[PDB]
Design a protein around this ligand. Structure first.
Ligand SMILES: *[C@@H]1O[C@H](CO)[C@@H](O)[C@H](O)[C@H]1NC(C)=O
Ligand SMILES: *[C@@H]1O[C@H](CO)[C@@H](O)[C@H](O)[C@H]1NC(C)=O
Lengths: 805, 814
């Protein structure tokens, strides 16, 4: 049982001359004292003096014990203890009345102190009238050094199941020698006289006359420090006589160490004691998500059985407001690039595919993926390399003289067959070979390209509206701003920078210590929507300046209703389809499959790494099947296929993270967020008045915030930051100590060279040959580096787990 | 001050069973042990045990003591000690003949260990033959911790002239109770037991049989630790009987700290006993003749005329060569380049405002020349060369009022300022004569903090007001006119001015803050890192000036200075003003009544300058060389008067400029304020540049006015760091769980700190409201009325310890 110790002593108040027991310390966790004003001091360890322990041993060697006493009140305990004192000739038969009357006085506490006008220690007297002691009345040292919402707090520190201990110290003049009385009850009782939070089990009584080298407050502190150690209170629970208590006291005195008066500095002399005290105390107490299975379709069933038992938890975990904030954030984060790519694809293919098709496809592939998905934190959507492939395929069909929207149907069919074949043979276990190398390179490149595109958009805005001395004002701005405008470029820059600054400031305030934790975290989790609202209001207040806004199609209509319909006839739309193209459409399908598979699986690897404390399981085969099948079915209806997005998924996962004081505690995983985001993206056509007032330049700040925030966990980025610091300030990670510095720098340089080569290939019109080089990084890590480095260096640098290396 | 102590035990040699003395520990202010190997562990402090101290006290309370014994060899000492044992019924007469042959034996040091083969604990018996101990033994603690070069350091640490002690322990079965012998030789002499050439003065001899709770190694260590302490050594060097040694032992045990075993020991709670140890140390030294080894006023009333002036001269001027020499760092150049703009911009603004206010009687050129001259002179002959003199706002308000008064009464304006200067001169001479600057002592930290906070807040407010003015001049419209003539000034709104100005200001502020934060990082080599971080403001200024210079078609307001060293209004003014009358003769009644505004100007200047000198030269900001008050006040006021003679305005020390200057010349530690660079070259160079600014028209005409607003915001935000009311205001929002560990948090309850902060904020608000009232010139009076508020009203609400802890005059000591 845990213990709660309380020390009380006989005192007299100056208001009225009446004795009473008042408390003066406590030993819940660390000792605390009671000042003169009536407020408790500061907690601290319990340091004793030499004479205190000496006299404690001396008076305990011949003390009086009452073990397994059967009483339930303080009066019975007091009477039995006085009877036991009388039995062993510790006090005289005529000293019993005064002692019993003194032990049964009222026990005050810290609260009543102010109502008394102060208290001072007192001594019992035969006539019953107190007097002032004939001994130096200097205040204690602990009072001098530690004294000159609390009840609930002390209730919280006291353990749930714990028993109380009461120590009574007092001075009486009619005695002849110090007397000790130790009592243990048969069962914990709540004594009415003396009040404590928990019920009393043990009881100390310390009385005696004035003697040299005896300070009774220090004797009480020594007894309470005895009663606060684990081993002594265990031995006090089991003991049945006094000899066992004496043996425990000898063991207690064996494992104490003295610190003499040393002239050394305080902190050094007090910190030199840690190993010695440690030694003395030691002397005192003497499955896989990816795996090859011997069954057809094994991975699919394995992932189903792993994930679907968590469906009710996935539904329920969505009741926090942080989920709503994450929804509002990712809605814009996924809508803006959707609109941009929609406009580009509409202007690229003569409006064969536009914004509405992309929006509908995004909505459907979000709803279905959120309902039937294994990891509902992914965000599916169109990408850039996919746009490049669409460009190339449209150019190819324009050159050879075939249709375009029809061939995509056969490409989707080939995709369906290939994904069925791949899922049948569980060929996703190859994800095991993708190490941290490729994940880090991919994420770094993606974030860097994101930031680059944002800055490119800004520079385009500056190029469209230059800084001139005069402008024309009979300009028609109905379709699009023709010619430069006075204040657009700078208002756009101001709004973007302001949004970025507010987002960063709120992100830092979230982790600060300025408000109550609940409201602070609630406000910090809604940082991005608050900043967006602020900047939207700021733009709404400005009247005369023009700024580009968000615009969506008018209704659920096809982009070009001249040549297209809601359903596409596979045999031929206007002219019949050749046979050789039907059979050769497999060639672009394989490349699209490689792209989709690699991107989706690498995204699932980055999001779902073992380091990010993901309790519920994540599925690979199921996500691939869903994504590719829905992409094919949407290509059937003429809508585009989509894929999992890196920045959007990483931002989604990072938004739903509750962090500890920083420590990553938990990630809120649920299916409601994705469903709501998809429903809003679908219904976006019914929210014209609200979206038509959101300027396009505000979302650039959000894009910069996402690109900067997604860059934190990357380790190549950390090693790049370490490229500048001198080796004196390098961190305490294993890859610093195990390998020399100028080898780590060579590693980082090799990886940066790989980045640069990937970038150069990305700028080359042979961009579609981007995936191959990427997978060619896998042999590089498997073969070439072990020809340069050593095995321990390579295991320590490219570690799959952070904690274990 | 330090001695040598040696502990030797009675052990057996492993090769062939025999008895001999072997040393086990040595003490030179620190304990060093040796293990079975024969090599001493690393030195450390000594930590005794409870049982050792208990048995040492018990055996010492009745142990025999021989003081001032006149013997030189170990045999005559053992003889006298055994005889004294015999006399006091300690040992039987049939025991001496054995103990003697036990004591007069070969002593072997550590060097002979390997040649011997190791040693073991041994127990003497009645016959004279060795034997094994009966009770079980255990591995020693200190030899297990520290044992698992030294002779050089040992022979180094012992002072050249010092005495040593010698402790001999060993067990004997034919004894009844433990015995202790303590002998102090009358004149220290060489002894065959110690190989070190140090002479011996004290000797402990501890004998007895085996018993529980008695470890003779630990008891010898306890005795040695008692002799190593200084108080017990001084007492033993002068004690004449056993009572004094007993008293010293009781004192040593009284001031000791024993700590019992615990369940979960931690290095954080064990550090909560630090003050206790200090108090115990103090109490130990309280009654000791020994002392522990590790444990003029700038303002003052002097009985002579002009005492303060001579005191300040004698204090400061001996440092003149160091003040000249300390300027060879590049940080001085960076501070010069920063403060040049920081002082030039408000000078130009206030000059233009005063020129348009008084119909160009006084303008920009007069202000520039006056600033230059009073800066050169103050840097050359000043006591505190970190102040920046210049025009202020309240001075502008007073100039407005005086111009209005002279307009109303029908008198001239530039002439009355001459008589005001004369009255100022006489008053400052009278004040310096009677050393009346000691009153600066009564102004506590309260008023200093309020003043600095208000100044910084007003600065930021004026900056934002300038920005809002820029926005008001060029609103955001749909169409503008382009046949606008901008020769005198841009008439009507312009398309892109307001946003380019805001962008430049924000960019400069952002870059300055980023470089200030990069200065403290650990990203580049320290030398280049600190050099780049120290030049943050000039680098940002150059970057933003170039950025604005590259943009061609957009208009932004630039810096403009007068064409030449000419007077503002050459119609009614001259370089020298005739005192009798410029156009009409001056009345007599006005000559005698011009004293009334002079007293107010004197009060303003004195208060501002002295509070500024307090803020700059507080003891907390590691200011080594002394700072003078009377001399600086005299210099400032005299140059202000002499400039009013020449028609130029009078100036005063500026708060924000001086604090920024002082903060720029500060070398900070990785934080700890390592040092501050104090020199006289920076101020003189700044003054010379401000004076020559008229010769840099092509360079200054290309610096946009909106870039300096970012610098103004940077100075106002940076100058807000050291304020303590600001810290307590930040603490107004945090919950009491995250409050820092400063004394004013722990000593007082929370809602009292909050009441204090609320009162001070109310005072701030009242100051602001009176500042906005057209009765602004009554702002200084109210300010000094804050001094009685702290002296009378607060002691009616708080208590003395609370008031001393909150309004602390020193930061570190509270
Ligand atoms: C829609 O498609 C037809 C098909 O010939 C084309 O002529 C027309 O330009 C398209 N509309 C656009 C591109 O807006
Ligand atoms: C100079 O002063 C005279 C008389 O005070 C005034 O008429 C003239 O306008 C002033 N010149 C300025 C303000 O440029």
């Amino acid at each position: 049982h845990k213990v709660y110790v309380e020390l009380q002593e006989l005192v007299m108040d100056e208001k009225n001359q009446e004795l009473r027991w008042m408390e003066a310390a406590r030993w819940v966790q660390l000792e605390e004292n009671l000042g003169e004003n009536g407020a408790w001091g500061r907690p601290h360890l319990s340091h004793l003096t030499f004479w205190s322990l000496l006299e404690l041993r001396r008076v305990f060697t011949k003390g009086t014990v009452l073990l397994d006493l059967q009483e339930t009140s303080l009066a019975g305990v007091a009477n039995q203890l006085l009877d036991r004192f009388i039995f062993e000739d510790q006090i005289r038969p005529q000293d019993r009345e005064e002692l019993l009357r003194a032990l049964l006085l009222k026990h005050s506490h810290a609260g009543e102190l102010e109502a008394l006008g102060g208290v001072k220690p007192a001594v019992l007297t035969r006539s019953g009238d107190p007097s002032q002691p004939l001994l130096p009345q200097h205040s204690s040292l602990e009072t001098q050094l530690f004294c000159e919402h609390s009840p609930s707090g002390i209730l919280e520190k006291i353990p749930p199941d714990s028993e109380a201990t009461l120590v009574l110290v007092g001075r009486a003049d009619f005695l002849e020698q110090p007397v000790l009385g130790f009592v243990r009850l048969q069962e914990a009782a709540e004594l009415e006289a003396v009040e404590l939070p928990v019920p009393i089990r043990f009881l100390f009584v310390l009385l005696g006359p004035e003697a040299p080298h005896i300070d009774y407050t220090q004797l009480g502190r020594a007894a309470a420090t005895l009663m606060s150690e684990r081993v002594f209170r265990i031995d006090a629970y089991m003991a049945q006589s006094r000899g066992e208590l004496l043996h425990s006291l000898e063991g207690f005195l064996d494992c104490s160490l003295v610190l003499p008066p040393t002239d050394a500095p305080s902190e050094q002399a007090l910190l030199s004691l840690v190993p010695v005290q440690r030694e003395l105390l030691r002397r005192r107490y003497q499955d896989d998500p990816l795996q090859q299975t011997g069954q057809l379709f094994g991975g699919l069933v394995r992932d189903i059985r792993r994930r679907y038992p968590y469906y009710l938890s996935d539904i329920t975990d969505a009741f926090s407001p942080q989920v709503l904030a994450a929804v509002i954030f990712i809605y814009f984060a996924a809508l803006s690039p959707a609109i941009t790519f929609g406009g580009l694809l509409g202007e690229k293919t003569r409006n064969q595919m536009g914004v509405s098709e992309l929006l509908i496809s995004t909505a459907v592939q979000g709803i279905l993926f959120a309902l039937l998905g294994a990891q509902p934190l992914l965000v599916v959507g169109f990408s850039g390399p996919l746009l490049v492939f669409e460009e190339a395929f449209f150019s190819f069909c324009e050159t050879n003289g075939l249709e375009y929207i029809v061939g995509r149907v056969w490409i989707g069919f080939w995709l369906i067959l290939l994904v069925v074949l791949v899922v049948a043979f569980e060929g996703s276990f190859l994800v095991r070979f993708i190490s941290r190398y490729t994940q880090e390179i991919f994420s770094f490149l993606i974030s860097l390209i994101f930031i680059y595109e944002t800055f490119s958009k800004l520079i385009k805005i500056f190029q469209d509206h230059p800084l001139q001395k005069t402008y024309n004002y009979n300009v028609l701005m109905v379709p699009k701003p023709q010619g430069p405008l006075p204040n657009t470029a700078l208002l756009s820059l101001v709004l973007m920078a302001g949004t970025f600054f507010f987002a960063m400031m709120l992100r830092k305030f979230k982790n600060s210590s300025y408000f109550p934790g609940k409201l602070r975290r609630v406000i910090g989790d809604f940082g991005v929507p608050i900043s967006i609202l602020i900047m939207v209001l700021v733009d709404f207040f400005i009247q005369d300046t023009y700024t580009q806004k968000l615009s969506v199609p008018d209704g659920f209509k096809v982009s070009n209703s001249s040549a297209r319909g809601w359903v596409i006839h596979p045999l031929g739309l206007r002219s019949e389809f050749p046979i050789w193209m039907m059979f050769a459409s497999a060639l672009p399908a394989l490349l699209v499959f490689i792209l989709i598979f690699l991107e989706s699986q690498i995204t699932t690897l980055i999001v779902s790494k073992p380091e990010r404390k993901m309790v519920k399981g994540s599925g690979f085969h199921l996500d691939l099947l869903l994504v590719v099948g829905m992409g094919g079915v949407a290509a059937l209806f003429g809508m585009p296929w989509l894929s999992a997005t890196t920045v959007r998924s990483v931002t989604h996962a990072n938004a739903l993270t509750v962090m500890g004081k920083a420590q990553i505690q938990e990630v809120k995983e649920q299916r409601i967020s994705g469903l709501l985001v998809a429903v809003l993206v679908g219904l976006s056509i019914l929210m014209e008045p609200i979206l038509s007032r959101i300027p396009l330049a505000v979302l650039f700040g959000i894009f910069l915030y996402m690109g900067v925030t997604s860059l934190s966990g990357i380790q190549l980025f950390d090693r790049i930051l370490l490229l500048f610091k001198p080796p004196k300030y390098h961190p305490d990670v294993p890859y610093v100590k195990r390998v020399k510095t100028w080898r780590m720098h060579l590693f980082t340089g090799i990886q940066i060279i790989c980045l640069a080569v990937l970038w150069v290939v990305k700028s080359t019109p042979a961009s579609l040959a981007l995936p191959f080089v990427l997978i060619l990084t896998v042999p590089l890590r498997r073969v070439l580096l072990p020809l340069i480095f050593r095995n321990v260096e390579l295991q320590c640098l490219d570690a799959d787990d952070a904690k274990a290396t």
